[PDB]
Amino acid sequence: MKQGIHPEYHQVIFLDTTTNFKFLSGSTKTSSEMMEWEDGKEYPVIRLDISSDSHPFYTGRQKFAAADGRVERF
Amino acid sequence: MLLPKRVKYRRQHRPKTTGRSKGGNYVTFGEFGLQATTTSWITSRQIESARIAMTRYMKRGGKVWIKIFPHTPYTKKPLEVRMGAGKGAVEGWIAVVKPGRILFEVAGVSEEVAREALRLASHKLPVKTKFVKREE
Amino acid sequence: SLKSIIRQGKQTRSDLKQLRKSGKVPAVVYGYGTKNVSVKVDEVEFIKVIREVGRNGVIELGVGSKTIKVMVADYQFDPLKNQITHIDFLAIN
Amino acid sequence: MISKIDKNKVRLKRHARVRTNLSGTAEKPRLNVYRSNKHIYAQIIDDNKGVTLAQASSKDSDIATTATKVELATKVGEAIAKKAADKGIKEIVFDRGGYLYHGRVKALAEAAR
Amino acid sequence: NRLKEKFNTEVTENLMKKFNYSSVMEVPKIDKIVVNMGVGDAVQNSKVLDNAVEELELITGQKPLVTKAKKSIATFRLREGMPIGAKVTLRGERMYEFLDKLISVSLPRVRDFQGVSKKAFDGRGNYTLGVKEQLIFPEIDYDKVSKVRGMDIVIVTTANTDEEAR
RNA sequence: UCUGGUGACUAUAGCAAGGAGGUCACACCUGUUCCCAUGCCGAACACAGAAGUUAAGGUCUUUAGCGACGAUGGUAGCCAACUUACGUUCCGCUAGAGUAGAACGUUGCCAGGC
RNA sequence: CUGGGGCGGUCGCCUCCUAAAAGGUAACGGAGGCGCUCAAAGGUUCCCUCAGAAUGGUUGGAAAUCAUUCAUAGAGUGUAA
RNA sequence: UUAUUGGAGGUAGAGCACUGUUUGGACGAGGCCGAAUUCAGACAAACUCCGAAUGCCAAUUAAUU
Ligand SMILES: [Mg+2]
Ligand SMILES: [Mg+2]
Ligand SMILES: [Mg+2]
Ligand SMILES: [Mg+2]
Ligand SMILES: [Mg+2]
Ligand SMILES: [Mg+2]
């Protein structure tokens, strides 16, 4: 972190629909809508992700389509 | 017609044809061996002409190796020129035998058969030879 | 079982070959429980080391006293005369 | 599975690259340094007959102190041999040989050079 | 910062009582995170691919060179990449960027890691690093991150990535 | 004696394996305001510090399996002499290389503390 | 110059080998170069260690970067040895 | 010239660790014959991990001419 040549980055709050569990850093900047104090009291403008709502593993998706299985009585 | 594939420099000296043999005078591969006892050259065309006469008496039966692969070139200057403008080109290859080193090793044969077949190829060589069998 | 030699008196000259015309063979002994004594065994009984065990074994020699339980270490087999010269011995302890 | 390299043996391969240019002439002697993590040592050798002249550590309990680059560094730099030691010759194996271990040379030029 | 205290509360009792180490400071720490992004053009396209990585992690990024000036493309000392080390406040943060979920096509990254005890990954395009925008980038900015640990067992690398989807 | 710092000794001393501990002394880490700086990153360099840890480094005791050193006897070559036109013998001095007997898991100077 | 002469080729410097363990030592004997280049590829003070062999990883040259491990010099030294 | 000690250098010999040349055994490297390494052997003026006999320079060395 030598001076001068780097772009600046600092923390945010990523307003996810599930608990907003991201107070980490990044180069994005916009208007601080909803600040907090339990997380980084900074530019709150990190909007939304799809982090912890449906993983391909740690969740449940919809069912599979169709086998042979003539369950329609032809 | 056994040749080296690559040779560093194509025009080389002639080997010091004195002394004893370096090594390789104990047989290692066959049961029966043929060593030399006098000090000539062999010129890469005996060594196949002693190989075709060897193979046919045994009808390509037991294992037969050679031990002398020619490395050195030797040059003959062309037909009747005056002396001295540079060496001539090569025309054959060679490997000098000292006295007392093994030429041929054969196996997979009784004694009374192979002792004939080494003799029949000992007349194709410009050297004097002598039968031998695994110093133990 | 059957061997004998004399402790070969040292500093021999290069007339060592005109006694190799008679069937001798020079040899030295090594070993734990010995010191390096050049011996002169005659090879006429070295058709009688094949005739006990072959190559790997034990046979004593008795150069005066202390017949060492020995083993034939190495040859110097020079061909063109079909003979052996300078065999070597090695105690087992 | 990277094994972190020690500072010590890298700071010894460089040592012979420095002490190949100078040697203790027994008339213009050679003081070296040492540093590990707390305490810095300093000898002075004749590299002809292989004897020392004046050992002076820092951890020698001369006085307890703090701030290892402040005067606790400087105290042994003022620790001096009243001998035939004129201007002596410094061995500088650790880097910044007028900056880092300079507490051993801020006071070595006080009287010892 | 909370990722570090979970490395100092959660994985402490686990990895020392599942792998059964003796001492307490024996768990696999996470060392450097190198990020190398090659370029297929030895001419001019790397002039526009400098800024892409700097939006994801603001360290400037070295332009490397070749070593040998090999056969049929390039001469010596061009530029073909951009390595960036990420070590402490970034390695606890870029690995804390668990938003490779934007890629979404079976985010399960790999099964076989490598034979020695490191763990290399892959990306494809503008998916990860959710700070960047999908407007000014008409080129596949695809990267190759890594993750090396002080552990000397690939089984230990299997446990240590418990919180990144495989 | 032992631990450390600086010397000499051709690796007989080092790698390769295995077991033992403490940090009174080295390390490992706690960070970067300052000293200084990474064509980037304080991992390294430097600085500020001491709650943890012996796993690692280094230390110590075994193993001749990896390299290394290595004798006595031989044989080839060879200065001098003799004989001879033979890819030669014969006699008198020096004397390897490989290979075996094996030695070997360092030695010793000077400092400061036990 | 010339294994008689014209013909062909050579004519000075540099590096091996022949050259026989000091130096020296020929032949129309065997192999190669040069008739310059560099304002930094010179001077100094610091710091770093290699080509390869594996092992996986957007692009895939078999090989354009990235790491990890075993690498005593098997790389490099503007130019031939 | 000779004895004594100390030295420079890489031939004869040997050897395959080095660049190179080799014939044999098992070793992997596609969908019925070939592609790295390992064991046992060989070769060398421009190959040496080794390496003598003799000569060669010097002892402020001692005997003889
Ligand atoms: Mg360090
Ligand atoms: Mg740090
Ligand atoms: Mg003419
Ligand atoms: Mg000479
Ligand atoms: Mg020779
Ligand atoms: Mg010759």
Coordinates of N, CA and C (backbone and C1' of nucleotides) in Angstrom, one line a residue, chain F residues 19-101:
Chain F
rG19 P 10.1 -40.6 15.0 O5' 10.7 -41.4 16.2 C5' 10.2 -41.1 17.5 C4' 11.3 -40.8 18.5 C3' 11.3 -39.4 19.2 O3' 10.3 -39.3 20.2 C1' 13.5 -39.8 18.5
rA20 P 9.7 -37.9 20.7 O5' 10.8 -37.2 21.5 C5' 11.3 -37.8 22.8 C4' 12.4 -36.9 23.4 C3' 12.1 -35.4 23.4 O3' 11.3 -35.1 24.5 C1' 14.2 -35.8 22.5
rG21 P 9.7 -34.6 24.3 O5' 9.8 -33.0 24.2 C5' 9.7 -32.3 25.4 C4' 11.1 -31.8 25.9 C3' 11.3 -30.3 25.8 O3' 10.8 -29.6 26.9 C1' 13.1 -31.4 24.8
rG22 P 9.4 -28.7 26.8 O5' 9.9 -27.2 27.2 C5' 10.4 -26.9 28.5 C4' 11.6 -26.0 28.4 C3' 11.4 -24.6 27.8 O3' 11.0 -23.7 28.8 C1' 13.2 -25.7 26.7
rU23 P 10.1 -22.4 28.5 O5' 11.0 -21.5 27.6 C5' 12.1 -20.8 28.2 C4' 13.1 -20.3 27.2 C3' 12.7 -19.1 26.4 O3' 13.9 -18.3 26.1 C1' 13.0 -20.9 24.9
rC24 P 14.3 -17.0 27.0 O5' 14.3 -17.6 28.5 C5' 14.1 -16.7 29.6 C4' 15.4 -16.7 30.5 C3' 16.7 -16.4 29.8 O3' 17.0 -15.1 29.8 C1' 16.8 -18.4 31.1
rA25 P 16.9 -14.2 28.5 O5' 17.8 -14.9 27.4 C5' 17.9 -14.4 26.1 C4' 19.0 -15.2 25.4 C3' 18.8 -15.3 23.9 O3' 19.3 -14.2 23.2 C1' 19.5 -17.4 24.8
rC26 P 18.6 -13.6 21.9 O5' 18.7 -14.7 20.8 C5' 17.7 -14.8 19.8 C4' 18.1 -15.8 18.7 C3' 17.0 -16.0 17.7 O3' 17.2 -15.0 16.6 C1' 17.7 -18.1 18.5
rA27 P 16.4 -15.1 15.2 O5' 14.9 -15.6 15.6 C5' 14.0 -15.8 14.5 C4' 13.5 -17.2 14.5 C3' 12.0 -17.3 14.4 O3' 11.6 -17.3 13.0 C1' 12.8 -18.6 16.2
rC28 P 10.7 -16.2 12.4 O5' 9.2 -16.7 12.4 C5' 8.9 -18.0 12.0 C4' 7.9 -18.6 12.9 C3' 6.7 -17.7 13.2 O3' 5.7 -17.8 12.3 C1' 7.5 -18.7 15.2
rC29 P 5.5 -16.7 11.2 O5' 3.9 -16.4 11.2 C5' 3.4 -15.3 11.8 C4' 3.1 -15.4 13.3 C3' 2.5 -14.3 14.0 O3' 1.0 -14.3 13.9 C1' 4.3 -15.1 15.3
rU30 P 0.2 -13.0 13.9 O5' 0.6 -12.2 15.2 C5' -0.4 -12.1 16.3 C4' -0.3 -10.7 16.8 C3' -0.5 -9.6 15.7 O3' -1.8 -9.4 15.5 C1' 1.4 -9.1 17.1
rG31 P -2.3 -9.2 13.9 O5' -1.3 -8.1 13.3 C5' -1.7 -7.0 12.7 C4' -1.1 -5.7 13.2 C3' -0.6 -4.7 12.2 O3' -1.6 -3.8 11.8 C1' 1.1 -5.1 13.9
rU32 P -1.6 -3.2 10.4 O5' -0.5 -2.1 10.4 C5' -0.6 -1.0 11.3 C4' 0.6 -0.1 11.2 C3' 0.8 0.6 9.9 O3' 1.2 1.9 10.0 C1' 2.7 -0.7 10.5
rU33 P 0.5 3.0 9.0 O5' 0.8 4.4 9.7 C5' 0.0 4.8 10.8 C4' 0.7 5.7 11.7 C3' 2.2 5.9 11.4 O3' 2.5 6.8 10.4 C1' 1.9 5.6 13.7
rC34 P 3.6 6.6 9.2 O5' 4.9 6.8 10.0 C5' 5.3 8.1 10.4 C4' 6.3 8.1 11.5 C3' 7.7 7.7 11.2 O3' 8.5 8.8 10.8 C1' 7.0 6.4 13.1
rC35 P 9.5 8.7 9.6 O5' 10.5 7.5 10.0 C5' 11.7 7.8 10.7 C4' 12.8 6.9 10.3 C3' 12.8 6.5 8.9 O3' 13.3 7.4 8.0 C1' 13.1 4.6 10.3
rC36 P 12.7 7.7 6.5 O5' 12.9 6.3 5.8 C5' 14.2 5.9 5.3 C4' 14.1 4.5 4.9 C3' 13.2 4.2 3.7 O3' 13.8 4.5 2.5 C1' 12.9 2.6 5.4
rA37 P 12.9 4.8 1.2 O5' 12.3 3.5 0.8 C5' 13.1 2.4 0.2 C4' 12.3 1.1 0.1 C3' 11.1 1.1 -0.8 O3' 11.6 0.8 -2.2 C1' 10.5 0.1 1.2
rU38 P 10.7 1.2 -3.4 O5' 9.6 0.1 -3.5 C5' 9.7 -1.0 -4.5 C4' 9.7 -2.3 -3.8 C3' 8.8 -3.4 -4.4 O3' 9.5 -4.1 -5.4 C1' 8.4 -3.2 -2.1
rG39 P 8.7 -4.8 -6.6 O5' 7.8 -3.7 -7.2 C5' 7.5 -3.6 -8.6 C4' 8.0 -2.4 -9.2 C3' 6.9 -1.5 -9.8 O3' 6.3 -0.7 -8.8 C1' 8.7 -1.7 -11.3
rC40 P 4.9 0.0 -9.1 O5' 3.9 -0.6 -8.1 C5' 3.6 -2.0 -8.2 C4' 2.8 -2.4 -7.0 C3' 3.5 -2.5 -5.7 O3' 3.0 -1.8 -4.6 C1' 2.5 -4.6 -6.2
rC41 P 1.5 -2.0 -3.9 O5' 1.6 -3.3 -3.1 C5' 0.4 -4.1 -2.9 C4' 0.7 -5.3 -2.0 C3' 1.5 -5.0 -0.8 O3' 0.8 -4.4 0.2 C1' 2.1 -7.1 -1.8
rG42 P 1.5 -3.9 1.6 O5' 1.2 -5.2 2.5 C5' 1.8 -5.3 3.8 C4' 3.2 -5.7 3.7 C3' 3.8 -6.5 4.9 O3' 3.6 -7.9 4.8 C1' 5.2 -4.6 4.4
rA43 P 3.7 -8.8 6.0 O5' 4.5 -10.1 5.5 C5' 4.1 -11.4 5.8 C4' 4.9 -12.4 5.0 C3' 6.4 -12.2 4.9 O3' 7.1 -12.7 6.0 C1' 5.5 -12.5 2.7
rA44 P 8.3 -11.9 6.7 O5' 9.2 -11.6 5.4 C5' 10.2 -12.5 5.0 C4' 11.1 -11.9 3.9 C3' 12.0 -10.8 4.4 O3' 13.1 -11.3 5.0 C1' 11.0 -10.3 2.3
rC45 P 13.7 -10.4 6.3 O5' 14.0 -9.0 5.7 C5' 15.2 -8.7 5.0 C4' 15.4 -7.2 4.7 C3' 15.2 -6.2 5.8 O3' 16.5 -6.1 6.5 C1' 14.0 -5.5 3.9
rA46 P 16.5 -6.2 8.1 O5' 15.8 -4.9 8.6 C5' 16.4 -3.6 8.5 C4' 15.5 -2.5 8.7 C3' 14.9 -2.3 10.1 O3' 15.7 -1.7 11.0 C1' 13.2 -2.1 8.5
rC47 P 15.7 -2.0 12.6 O5' 14.4 -1.3 13.1 C5' 14.2 0.1 13.1 C4' 12.8 0.5 13.3 C3' 12.1 0.1 14.6 O3' 12.5 0.9 15.7 C1' 10.7 -0.4 12.7
rA48 P 12.5 0.2 17.1 O5' 11.0 0.0 17.5 C5' 10.1 1.1 17.7 C4' 8.8 0.6 18.1 C3' 8.7 -0.5 19.1 O3' 8.8 0.0 20.5 C1' 7.3 -1.0 17.3
rG49 P 9.6 -0.9 21.5 O5' 8.7 -2.2 21.7 C5' 7.7 -2.2 22.6 C4' 6.6 -3.3 22.2 C3' 6.7 -4.6 22.9 O3' 6.0 -4.6 24.1 C1' 6.4 -4.9 20.6
rA50 P 6.1 -5.7 25.3 O5' 5.4 -6.9 24.8 C5' 4.5 -7.7 25.6 C4' 4.4 -9.1 25.1 C3' 5.1 -10.1 26.0 O3' 4.5 -11.4 26.0 C1' 6.2 -10.1 23.9
rA51 P 4.1 -12.1 27.4 O5' 2.5 -11.8 27.6 C5' 1.7 -12.5 28.5 C4' 0.6 -13.2 27.7 C3' 1.0 -14.5 27.0 O3' 1.0 -15.6 27.8 C1' -0.2 -13.0 25.5
rG52 P 1.5 -17.0 27.3 O5' 0.3 -17.7 26.5 C5' 0.4 -19.0 26.1 C4' 0.2 -19.1 24.6 C3' 1.2 -19.9 23.8 O3' 0.8 -21.3 23.8 C1' 0.8 -17.8 22.7
rU53 P 1.3 -22.3 24.8 O5' 2.1 -23.3 23.9 C5' 1.5 -23.8 22.7 C4' 2.3 -23.6 21.5 C3' 3.7 -24.2 21.5 O3' 3.7 -25.6 21.4 C1' 3.7 -22.0 20.6
rU54 P 3.9 -26.5 22.7 O5' 5.4 -27.2 22.4 C5' 5.4 -28.4 21.6 C4' 6.4 -28.2 20.5 C3' 7.8 -28.8 20.8 O3' 8.3 -29.4 19.6 C1' 8.0 -26.5 20.2
rA55 P 8.2 -30.9 19.3 O5' 7.4 -31.0 17.9 C5' 6.1 -30.7 17.8 C4' 5.7 -30.5 16.3 C3' 6.8 -30.0 15.4 O3' 7.6 -31.0 15.0 C1' 4.9 -28.6 15.2
rA56 P 9.2 -30.8 14.9 O5' 9.4 -29.6 13.9 C5' 9.2 -29.8 12.5 C4' 9.2 -28.5 11.7 C3' 10.6 -27.8 11.6 O3' 11.5 -28.5 10.9 C1' 8.9 -26.2 11.9
rG57 P 13.0 -28.8 11.5 O5' 13.8 -27.5 11.3 C5' 13.7 -26.8 10.0 C4' 14.2 -25.3 10.2 C3' 15.6 -25.2 10.7 O3' 16.6 -25.4 9.8 C1' 14.2 -23.7 11.9
rG58 P 18.1 -26.0 10.2 O5' 18.7 -25.0 11.2 C5' 20.0 -25.0 11.7 C4' 20.1 -24.6 13.1 C3' 20.6 -25.6 14.1 O3' 22.0 -25.7 14.1 C1' 18.7 -24.5 14.9
rU59 P 22.7 -27.2 14.3 O5' 22.3 -27.5 15.9 C5' 22.9 -26.7 16.9 C4' 22.3 -27.2 18.2 C3' 22.6 -28.7 18.5 O3' 23.9 -28.9 19.0 C1' 20.3 -28.1 19.1
rC60 P 24.7 -30.1 18.3 O5' 24.2 -31.4 19.2 C5' 24.4 -31.3 20.6 C4' 23.4 -32.3 21.2 C3' 23.6 -33.7 20.8 O3' 24.7 -34.4 21.5 C1' 21.3 -33.2 20.8
rU61 P 25.5 -35.5 20.8 O5' 24.5 -36.8 20.8 C5' 24.3 -37.5 22.0 C4' 23.5 -38.8 21.7 C3' 24.0 -39.6 20.5 O3' 25.1 -40.5 20.9 C1' 21.7 -39.3 20.5
rU62 P 25.8 -41.3 19.8 O5' 25.0 -42.6 19.6 C5' 24.8 -43.3 18.4 C4' 23.5 -44.0 18.2 C3' 23.3 -44.8 17.0 O3' 23.8 -46.1 17.0 C1' 21.4 -43.4 17.4
rU63 P 24.7 -46.6 15.8 O5' 23.8 -46.5 14.6 C5' 22.6 -47.4 14.4 C4' 22.2 -47.4 13.0 C3' 23.2 -47.3 11.9 O3' 23.9 -48.5 11.6 C1' 21.3 -45.9 11.4
rA64 P 25.5 -48.5 11.7 O5' 26.0 -48.3 10.2 C5' 25.6 -49.2 9.2 C4' 25.4 -48.5 7.9 C3' 26.1 -49.0 6.7 O3' 25.4 -48.7 5.5 C1' 26.8 -46.8 7.1
rG65 P 25.2 -49.8 4.4 O5' 23.7 -49.7 4.0 C5' 23.2 -50.0 2.6 C4' 22.3 -48.9 2.2 C3' 22.9 -47.7 1.5 O3' 23.1 -47.9 0.1 C1' 21.4 -47.0 3.2
rC66 P 24.3 -47.1 -0.6 O5' 23.9 -45.6 -0.6 C5' 22.9 -45.2 -1.5 C4' 22.9 -43.7 -1.7 C3' 24.3 -43.1 -2.1 O3' 24.6 -43.3 -3.5 C1' 23.1 -41.7 -0.6
rG67 P 26.1 -43.3 -4.0 O5' 26.4 -41.7 -4.2 C5' 27.7 -41.3 -4.5 C4' 27.9 -39.9 -3.8 C3' 29.3 -39.7 -3.4 O3' 30.2 -39.1 -4.4 C1' 27.9 -39.2 -1.6
rA68 P 31.6 -39.8 -4.7 O5' 32.5 -39.2 -3.5 C5' 32.6 -37.9 -3.2 C4' 33.2 -37.6 -1.9 C3' 34.5 -38.4 -1.6 O3' 35.6 -37.8 -2.2 C1' 33.1 -38.6 0.2
rC69 P 36.8 -38.7 -2.9 O5' 37.7 -39.2 -1.6 C5' 38.3 -38.2 -0.8 C4' 38.8 -38.8 0.5 C3' 39.8 -39.9 0.4 O3' 41.1 -39.4 0.3 C1' 38.1 -40.4 2.0
rG70 P 42.1 -40.2 -0.7 O5' 42.1 -41.7 -0.1 C5' 43.0 -42.1 1.0 C4' 42.7 -43.4 1.5 C3' 42.9 -44.6 0.7 O3' 44.2 -45.0 0.5 C1' 40.8 -44.8 1.7
rA71 P 44.7 -45.8 -0.8 O5' 45.9 -46.6 -0.2 C5' 46.7 -46.2 0.9 C4' 47.0 -47.3 1.9 C3' 47.6 -48.6 1.3 O3' 49.0 -48.4 1.1 C1' 45.9 -49.1 2.9
rU72 P 49.7 -49.2 -0.1 O5' 49.7 -50.7 0.4 C5' 50.5 -51.1 1.5 C4' 50.4 -52.6 1.8 C3' 50.7 -53.4 0.5 O3' 52.1 -53.6 0.3 C1' 48.7 -54.2 1.6
rG73 P 52.6 -53.9 -1.1 O5' 52.7 -55.5 -1.2 C5' 52.7 -56.1 -2.4 C4' 51.6 -57.1 -2.5 C3' 51.1 -57.4 -3.9 O3' 51.9 -58.4 -4.6 C1' 49.2 -57.1 -2.5
rG74 P 52.9 -57.8 -5.7 O5' 52.6 -58.7 -6.9 C5' 52.3 -58.1 -8.1 C4' 50.8 -58.4 -8.5 C3' 50.4 -57.9 -9.8 O3' 50.8 -58.7 -10.9 C1' 48.8 -57.4 -8.2
rU75 P 52.2 -58.3 -11.7 O5' 51.7 -58.1 -13.2 C5' 50.7 -58.9 -13.8 C4' 49.6 -58.1 -14.2 C3' 49.9 -56.9 -15.1 O3' 50.3 -57.3 -16.4 C1' 48.3 -56.3 -13.6
rA76 P 51.6 -56.6 -17.1 O5' 51.0 -55.3 -17.8 C5' 50.0 -55.4 -18.9 C4' 49.5 -54.1 -19.2 C3' 50.5 -53.0 -19.6 O3' 50.8 -53.1 -20.9 C1' 48.9 -52.2 -18.0
rG77 P 52.3 -52.6 -21.4 O5' 52.4 -51.1 -21.1 C5' 51.7 -50.1 -21.8 C4' 51.9 -48.7 -21.1 C3' 53.3 -48.2 -21.2 O3' 53.6 -47.5 -22.3 C1' 52.5 -48.1 -19.0
rC78 P 55.1 -47.5 -23.0 O5' 56.1 -47.1 -21.9 C5' 56.3 -45.7 -21.6 C4' 57.0 -45.5 -20.3 C3' 58.4 -45.8 -20.3 O3' 59.2 -44.7 -20.7 C1' 57.4 -46.7 -18.4
rC79 P 60.3 -44.9 -21.9 O5' 61.6 -44.4 -21.1 C5' 61.8 -43.0 -20.9 C4' 62.9 -42.7 -19.9 C3' 64.2 -43.5 -20.0 O3' 65.0 -43.0 -21.0 C1' 63.5 -43.6 -17.8
rA80 P 65.9 -43.9 -21.9 O5' 66.8 -44.7 -20.9 C5' 67.9 -44.1 -20.2 C4' 68.7 -45.1 -19.4 C3' 69.0 -46.4 -20.2 O3' 70.2 -46.2 -21.0 C1' 68.1 -47.0 -18.1
rA81 P 70.3 -46.9 -22.4 O5' 70.7 -48.4 -22.0 C5' 71.9 -48.7 -21.2 C4' 71.9 -50.1 -20.7 C3' 71.8 -51.2 -21.7 O3' 73.1 -51.5 -22.3 C1' 70.3 -51.7 -20.0
rC82 P 73.2 -51.7 -23.9 O5' 72.6 -53.2 -24.1 C5' 73.3 -54.3 -23.5 C4' 72.4 -55.6 -23.6 C3' 72.0 -56.0 -25.0 O3' 73.1 -56.6 -25.7 C1' 70.3 -56.3 -23.4
rU83 P 73.1 -56.5 -27.3 O5' 72.0 -57.5 -27.8 C5' 72.1 -58.9 -27.5 C4' 70.8 -59.6 -27.8 C3' 70.2 -59.4 -29.2 O3' 70.8 -60.2 -30.2 C1' 68.5 -59.1 -27.6
rU84 P 71.0 -59.7 -31.7 O5' 69.5 -59.6 -32.3 C5' 68.7 -60.8 -32.5 C4' 67.3 -60.5 -32.6 C3' 66.9 -59.7 -33.9 O3' 66.8 -60.5 -35.0 C1' 65.8 -58.7 -32.0
rA85 P 66.4 -59.9 -36.5 O5' 64.9 -60.0 -36.5 C5' 64.2 -59.7 -37.7 C4' 62.8 -59.1 -37.4 C3' 62.1 -58.5 -38.7 O3' 60.7 -58.5 -38.4 C1' 62.7 -56.7 -37.2
rC86 P 59.7 -59.0 -39.4 O5' 58.5 -59.6 -38.6 C5' 58.0 -58.9 -37.5 C4' 57.9 -59.7 -36.2 C3' 56.9 -59.2 -35.2 O3' 55.6 -59.6 -35.4 C1' 59.0 -59.6 -34.2
rG87 P 54.3 -58.9 -34.7 O5' 54.3 -57.4 -34.9 C5' 54.9 -56.5 -34.0 C4' 54.0 -55.6 -33.2 C3' 53.2 -56.3 -32.1 O3' 53.1 -55.5 -31.0 C1' 51.7 -55.2 -33.6
rU88 P 53.3 -56.1 -29.6 O5' 54.9 -56.5 -29.6 C5' 55.5 -57.0 -28.5 C4' 56.5 -58.1 -28.9 C3' 57.3 -58.6 -27.7 O3' 56.7 -59.6 -27.0 C1' 58.7 -58.2 -29.7
rU89 P 55.9 -59.3 -25.7 O5' 56.3 -60.5 -24.7 C5' 57.4 -60.3 -23.9 C4' 58.6 -61.1 -24.4 C3' 59.8 -61.2 -23.5 O3' 59.6 -62.2 -22.5 C1' 60.5 -60.6 -25.6
rC90 P 59.2 -61.9 -21.0 O5' 60.6 -61.9 -20.2 C5' 61.5 -62.9 -20.4 C4' 62.9 -62.4 -20.3 C3' 63.1 -61.5 -19.1 O3' 63.3 -62.2 -17.9 C1' 64.1 -60.6 -21.0
rC91 P 62.6 -61.5 -16.6 O5' 63.7 -60.6 -16.0 C5' 65.0 -61.1 -15.7 C4' 66.0 -60.0 -15.5 C3' 65.6 -58.9 -14.6 O3' 65.8 -59.2 -13.2 C1' 66.5 -57.9 -16.6
rG92 P 64.9 -58.5 -12.1 O5' 65.5 -57.1 -11.9 C5' 66.7 -56.9 -11.1 C4' 67.2 -55.5 -11.4 C3' 66.4 -54.4 -10.8 O3' 66.8 -54.1 -9.4 C1' 66.9 -53.9 -13.1
rC93 P 65.6 -53.7 -8.4 O5' 65.3 -52.1 -8.8 C5' 64.4 -51.4 -8.0 C4' 64.4 -49.9 -8.4 C3' 63.1 -49.2 -8.1 O3' 63.0 -48.7 -6.8 C1' 63.9 -48.7 -10.3
rU94 P 61.6 -48.8 -6.0 O5' 60.7 -47.8 -6.8 C5' 60.6 -46.4 -6.3 C4' 60.1 -45.5 -7.4 C3' 58.6 -45.4 -7.6 O3' 58.0 -44.5 -6.7 C1' 59.7 -45.7 -9.7
rA95 P 56.8 -44.9 -5.8 O5' 55.7 -45.5 -6.9 C5' 55.0 -44.6 -7.7 C4' 54.0 -45.3 -8.6 C3' 53.0 -46.2 -7.8 O3' 51.8 -45.5 -7.4 C1' 54.0 -47.4 -9.5
rG96 P 51.0 -46.0 -6.2 O5' 50.0 -47.0 -6.8 C5' 48.7 -46.6 -7.1 C4' 48.6 -45.7 -8.3 C3' 47.2 -45.4 -8.8 O3' 46.6 -44.4 -8.0 C1' 48.7 -45.9 -10.6
rA97 P 45.0 -44.5 -7.7 O5' 44.3 -44.8 -9.1 C5' 43.9 -43.8 -10.0 C4' 43.0 -44.3 -11.0 C3' 41.9 -45.2 -10.5 O3' 40.8 -44.5 -10.0 C1' 43.0 -46.2 -12.3
rG98 P 40.0 -45.0 -8.8 O5' 39.2 -46.3 -9.3 C5' 38.2 -46.2 -10.2 C4' 37.9 -47.5 -10.9 C3' 37.3 -48.6 -10.0 O3' 35.9 -48.4 -9.7 C1' 39.1 -49.5 -11.2
rU99 P 35.4 -48.4 -8.2 O5' 35.8 -49.8 -7.7 C5' 35.1 -51.0 -8.2 C4' 35.9 -52.2 -8.0 C3' 35.8 -52.8 -6.6 O3' 34.6 -53.5 -6.3 C1' 38.0 -53.0 -7.5
rA100 P 33.8 -53.0 -5.0 O5' 35.0 -52.8 -3.9 C5' 34.8 -53.3 -2.6 C4' 35.6 -54.6 -2.4 C3' 36.1 -54.8 -1.0 O3' 35.2 -55.4 -0.1 C1' 37.8 -55.3 -2.7
rG101 P 35.2 -54.9 1.4 O5' 36.7 -55.0 1.9 C5' 37.1 -56.3 2.4 C4' 38.2 -56.1 3.4 C3' 37.9 -55.4 4.6 O3' 37.2 -56.1 5.6 C1' 40.0 -54.7 3.8

